[PDB]
Ligand binder design. Structure first.
Ligand SMILES: CCCCCCCCCCCCOS(=O)(=O)O
Ligand SMILES: CCCCCCCCCCCCOS(=O)(=O)O
Ligand SMILES: CCCCCCCCCCCCOS(=O)(=O)O
Ligand SMILES: CCCCCCCCCCCCOS(=O)(=O)O
Ligand SMILES: CCCCCCCCCCCCOS(=O)(=O)O
Ligand SMILES: CCCCCCCCCCCCOS(=O)(=O)O
Ligand SMILES: [Li+]
Length: 155
């Protein structure tokens, strides 16, 4: 795909989620686990966002969250999320998704200097209740971890 076009469509999709949002979400960090067991830490925090389901049935969100990181220091993050969404069952309320988030975070490790974030997203949910997650890539201490939250859609 073309990058000028891609960029305008991305920017467009962000602006429509801010200007014409459909719902709010409550984000409740739930669980982290490692991808390569030889896991279950439970982060404290929370967040809020705006979201919509588009004409293709795909999810868009703008969010702001804060959680305790792996040194038990507050870690804020804000960004955009998108998922390609499928509703494969007879009850259309079940939804499965895969996508990405782009945003900015900051950590105590680096004196809260802002850091750009680009990570994958996946989710499964029923109606307004969704278990959604990311994966932090890295080989050795850096990452290889999943982080999941409950997302409760309201209004
Ligand atoms: C509770 C959510 C907070 C999320 C982070 C802030 C989003 C900033 C605006 C994005 C839309 C860009 O604005 S627009 O004027 O181009 O449409
Ligand atoms: C860089 C900061 C990002 C915002 C985090 C929210 C701070 C609220 C104050 C709780 C202090 C600690 O309270 S405790 O519930 O953790 O004991
Ligand atoms: C739709 C909501 C999306 C929420 C995404 C949460 C990502 C948190 C981790 C940021 C990167 C941290 O990188 S680190 O290597 O410094 O840990
Ligand atoms: C937490 C796990 C997320 C998994 C995401 C991948 C979902 C792929 C589903 C295809 C749906 C079936 O096809 S459908 O065309 O009938 O909808
Ligand atoms: C336009 C919808 C096409 C479906 C593809 C979505 C797959 C996830 C994209 C990046 C995942 C990291
Ligand atoms: C639409 C009517 C109002 C919403 C209440 C639905 C409660 C769903 C709880 C389970 C979600 C579990 O996620 S699951 O999709 O894997 O089951
Ligand atoms: Li709404």
């Amino acid at each position: 795909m073309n990058a000028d076009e891609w960029m305008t469509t991305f920017r467009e999709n962000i602006a429509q989620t801010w200007q014409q949002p459909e719902h709010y979400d409550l984000y409740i960090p739930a669980i982290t686990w490692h991808a390569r067991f030889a896991y279950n830490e439970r982060p404290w925090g929370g967040g809020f966002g705006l979201s919509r389901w588009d004409e293709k049935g795909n999810w868009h969100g703008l969010y702001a969250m804060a959680f305790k990181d792996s040194w038990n220091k507050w870690e804020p993050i804000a960004g955009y999320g998108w998922e390609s969404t499928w509703r494969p069952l007879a009850d259309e309320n079940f939804h499965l998704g895969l996508g990405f988030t782009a945003g900015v975070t900051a950590r105590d490790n680096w004196n809260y200097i802002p850091l750009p974030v680009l990570l994958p997203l996946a989710s499964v949910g029923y109606g307004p209740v969704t278990f959604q997650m990311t994966y932090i890539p890295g080989t050795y201490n850096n990452g290889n971890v999943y982080f999941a939250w409950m997302r409760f859609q309201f209004l």
